[PDB]
Curated annotation (Swiss-Prot), chain B:
Glycans are attached at residues 15, 34, 36. Binds to host ACE2. RBD also interacts with the N-linked glycan on 'Asn-90' of ACE2. Cleavage of S generates a polybasic C-terminal sequence on S1 that binds to host Neuropilin-1 (NRP1) and Neuropilin-2 (NRP2) receptors. Interacts with host integrin alpha-5/beta-1 (ITGA5:ITGB1) and with ACE2 in complex with integrin alpha-5/beta-1 (ITGA5:ITGB1). May interact via cytoplasmic c-terminus with M protein. May interact (via N-terminus) with host bilirubin and biliverdin, thereby preventing antibody binding to the SARS-CoV-2 spike NTD via an allosteric mechanism. The gene is S. This is Spike protein S1. Disulfide bonds join 20-29. Residues 31-39 are annotated as: Disordered. Changing residue 35 to H: In strain: Eta/B.1.525. Attaches the virion to the cell membrane by interacting with host receptor, initiating the infection. The major receptor is host ACE2. When S2/S2' has been cleaved, binding to the receptor triggers direct fusion at the cell membrane. When S2/S2' has not been cleaved, binding to the receptor results in internalization of the virus by endocytosis using host TFRC and GRM2 and leading to fusion of the virion membrane with the host endosomal membrane. Alternatively, may use NRP1/NRP2 and integrin as entry receptors.
Amino acid sequence: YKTPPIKDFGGFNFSQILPDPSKPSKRSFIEDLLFNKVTLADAGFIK
Amino acid sequence: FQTRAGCLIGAEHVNNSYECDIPIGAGICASYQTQTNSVASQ
Ligand SMILES: *[C@@H]1O[C@H](CO)[C@@H](O[C@@H]2O[C@H](CO)[C@@H](O[C@@H]3O[C@H](CO)[C@@H](O)[C@H](O[C@H]4O[C@H](CO)[C@@H](O)[C@H](O)[C@@H]4O)[C@@H]3O)[C@H](O)[C@H]2NC(C)=O)[C@H](O)[C@H]1NC(C)=O
Ligand SMILES: *[C@@H]1O[C@H](CO)[C@@H](O[C@@H]2O[C@H](CO)[C@@H](O)[C@H](O)[C@H]2NC(C)=O)[C@H](O)[C@H]1NC(C)=O
Ligand SMILES: *[C@@H]1O[C@H](CO)[C@@H](O)[C@H](O)[C@H]1NC(C)=O
C-alpha cells in the first residue's frame, strides 16, 4: 500500500514516521535515527 | 553475474521482478523459467 500524496489526516501528522523521499534509503526520520543510533559491526558486505 | 552475495555463474540476469523462488541473498532470488533463452527454452 502507498500513502496518498495529500496528507489530510484530520489534523494528525505522520511526517516523522512516513518515508522521506529525499533520502536515498526510503526510510523515515525515526528509522534513520535508530539506524544511526545502533553501531553495527560485521556488516558482511562483499568486502 | 556479480551480486552482493558473491559471484553468480550460470544464471541469466533479468530486470523484471517476481516472487522469491530460490533465495540467494541480499535481495536476489533465482528461478527456472522460459525467460527468453525464444519462448519455450528453459
Ligand atoms: C509534522 O511535525 C513535524 C515536526 O518536525 C513538522 O516538520 C517540521 O517541524 C519543525 C518544528 O516543529 C517546523 O518548524 C521548524 O523549526 C526549525 C527550528 O526548530 C526551523 O529550523 C525550521 O525552519 C526551516 O526548515 C523547515 C524544514 O526544512 C521548513 O519547513 C521551514 O519552512 C523553514 O524553511 C522550521 O521553522 C517545520 O516547519 C516543520 N516542517 C518541515 C518540512 O520540516 C511537520 O511540518 C508537521 N507536518 C505538517 C503538515 O506541518
Ligand atoms: C574485486 O572486488 C573489488 C571491490 O572489493 C573490485 O576491484 C576493483 O573494482 C573497481 C571498479 O569497480 C576498480 O578499482 C578495479 O576495476 C578493481 N580493482 C582494483 C585494484 O581496484 C572488484 O569488485 C573486483 N575486481 C575487479 C577487477 O573487478
Ligand atoms: C535491464 O534493465 C533495463 C531495462 O529494463 C536496461 O537498461 C538494462 O540494460 C537491462 N539489463 C539486462 C541484463 O537486461
